Amino acid sequence: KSPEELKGIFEKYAAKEGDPNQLSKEELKLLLQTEFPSLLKGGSTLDELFEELDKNGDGEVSFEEFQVLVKKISQ
Secondary structure: OOHHHHHHHHHHHHHHHOOOOEEOHHHHHHHHHHHOHHHHOOOOOHHHHHHHHOOOOOOOEEHHHHHHHHHHHHO
C-alpha cells in the first residue's frame, strides 16, 4: 500500500482506540491482523516488533517511527 494508504490505515487503527497520532500494541495488532497478518510473527513477533518500531522509546508507535515497519516491508 502507498505511504498515503498506510497513513490512512495508521489513522484508522490509531483513531479506533482514540489517540490519532500514536498506535498502541492493540491498534498495531488489529492493523497487522487486517492488513499484514504475517507481520504479527514475520520479521519479529508483535511484542518485539512493537519495541523495534518504538524507536522514540515512549512505548506507543508514531507514524514517523512506524516507517521502520514500511522499511522492513520494503526489505
